[PDB]
Design an enzyme around this catalytic site. Structure first.
Site, PDB file in Angstrom:
ATOM      1  N   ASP A  53      -3.282 -26.886   4.349  1.00 47.05           N
ATOM      2  CA  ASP A  53      -3.036 -27.726   4.873  1.00 47.05           C
ATOM      3  C   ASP A  53      -2.794 -28.634   3.689  1.00 47.05           C
ATOM      4  O   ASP A  53      -2.079 -29.992   3.221  1.00 47.05           O
ATOM      5  CB  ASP A  53      -4.128 -28.976   5.833  1.00 47.05           C
ATOM      6  CG  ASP A  53      -3.970 -27.205   6.682  1.00 47.05           C
ATOM      7  OD1 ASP A  53      -2.812 -27.159   7.063  1.00 47.05           O
ATOM      8  OD2 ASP A  53      -4.019 -28.457   7.896  1.00 47.05           O
ATOM      9  N   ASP A  79       4.513 -23.005   5.560  1.00 49.81           N
ATOM     10  CA  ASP A  79       4.769 -23.799   4.014  1.00 49.81           C
ATOM     11  C   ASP A  79       6.714 -23.056   3.544  1.00 49.81           C
ATOM     12  O   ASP A  79       6.981 -23.149   2.124  1.00 49.81           O
ATOM     13  CB  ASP A  79       4.319 -21.867   3.094  1.00 49.81           C
ATOM     14  CG  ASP A  79       5.043 -21.167   2.940  1.00 49.81           C
ATOM     15  OD1 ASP A  79       5.773 -20.577   4.352  1.00 49.81           O
ATOM     16  OD2 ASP A  79       5.188 -20.121   2.315  1.00 49.81           O
TER      17      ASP A  79
END
Length: 163
Positions: A53, A79
């Site tokens: 994160d 991502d």
């Protein structure tokens, strides 16, 4: 929070439709950056989602620091990112994509033990050539991303008829 400023994928069609129409009536260049963090799942497993994160935060920050307010940044997967560059020439686009890729590479991240975390981006780039359908423009930019991954990642690739 930087991640809250990111746009959902569902807004891609309505945004592209309008942004393409504008690029044809005016004849202004338009480009797309499709970005995927290298070996992210592997990083996510080894160092954890808090680390994954934080990576997504640093990576997102690199984007907004190198795009105008008039540009758009989307986050779809964990991502997976899409940047729409309004009014950016090919020379400008590759320069922008390079600033982004370099920034992520040069961001070293300290681990829980004190080691360095390997960060890198793969970026596909494609220029708008007048075609009305936006999906075609995303396809070739994604194809460009495919090659950047295939050619060892941490690099930028521009789509060409040669493949």
């Amino acid at each position: 929070d930087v991640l809250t400023k990111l746009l959902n994928r569902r807004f891609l069609p309505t945004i592209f439709k309008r942004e393409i129409a504008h690029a044809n009536r005016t004849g202004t260049p338009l480009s797309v950056l499709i970005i995927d963090v290298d070996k992210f799942k592997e990083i996510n497993d080894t160092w954890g989602h808090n680390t994954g994160d934080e990576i997504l935060r640093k990576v997102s920050q690199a984007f907004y620091d190198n795009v105008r307010s008039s540009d758009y940044v989307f986050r779809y997967g964990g991502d997976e990112f899409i940047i729409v560059l309004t009014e950016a020439s090919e020379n400008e686009t590759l320069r922008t994509a390079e600033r982004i890729r370099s920034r992520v590479e040069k961001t070293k991240l300290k681990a829980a033990n004190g080691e360095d975390i390997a960060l890198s981006l793969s970026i596909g780039a494609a220029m708008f050539n007048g075609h009305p359908d936006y999906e075609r423009l995303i396809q070739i930019a994604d194809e460009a991303l495919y090659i950047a991954k295939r050619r060892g990642r941490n690099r930028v690739e521009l789509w060409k008829a040669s493949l």
